Ligand binder design. Structure first.
Ligand SMILES: O[C@@H]1[C@@H](O)[C@H](O[C@@H]2CO[C@@H](O)[C@H](O)[C@H]2O)OC[C@H]1O
Ligand code: XYP
Ligand code: CA
Length: 161
């Protein structure tokens, strides 16, 4: 593993919110385990747990990212996405975003989201690369309660290929 987060130590570490949402390491809920990272008070689809991973990785490499996700309120099914937030030339005002994977989850059931990703080369000027989870993109005016349900992540892992 290049990077692993199982939350079993109860530490938030470098995980962060993307807007006004709340992150919390909870106990009593986890993927085959007692702890996981809960994201709640989401009021946009793009709210979700984020972590910077570029320092763990070699620029110009391909790595395998996976994590487990679960939600337990609202609709019978819901899509969750795994996405990347990228920063180039330390320009915080010109970020880009890409979805790397997506699965449909069933209420109460843990499921794995995974894909190979490319870490852009040094010569791109890449200066941040953050993985995050969210619900499928759409804008503020179209946002509904099914979109902004709380959800859990666990067993986040990045591996060499
Ligand atoms: O799926 C991606 C969304 O997560 C991304 O949403 C942005 C996230 O950061 C916030 O600071 C921005 O306001 C918000 O638009 O949009 C692109 C999409 O691919
Ligand atoms: O590529 C786009 C991504 O940056 C955002 O979500 C919509 C996608 O089309
Ligand atoms: Ca765990």
């Amino acid at each position: 593993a290049l990077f692993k987060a199982d939350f079993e130590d109860g530490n938030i570490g470098n995980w962060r919110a993307r807007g006004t949402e709340k992150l919390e390491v909870v106990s009593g809920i986890g993927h085959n385990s007692n702890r996981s990272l809960k994201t709640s008070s989401r009021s946009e689809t793009y709210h979700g747990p984020l972590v910077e991973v570029l320092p763990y990785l070699q620029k110009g490499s391909t790595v395998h990212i996976s994590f487990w996700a679960m939600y337990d309120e609202g609709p019978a099914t819901q899509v969750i996405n795994g996405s990347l937030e990228k920063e180039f030339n330390r320009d915080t005002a010109n970020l880009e975003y890409a979805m790397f994977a997506s699965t449909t989850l069933n209420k109460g059931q843990w499921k794995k989201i995974e894909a190979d990703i490319i870490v852009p080369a040094e010569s791109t000027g890449i200066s941040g690369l953050r993985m995050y989870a969210e619900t499928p993109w759409k804008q503020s005016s179209e946002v509904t309660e099914t979109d902004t349900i709380p959800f859990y992540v666990d067993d986040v892992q990045i591996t060499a290929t």
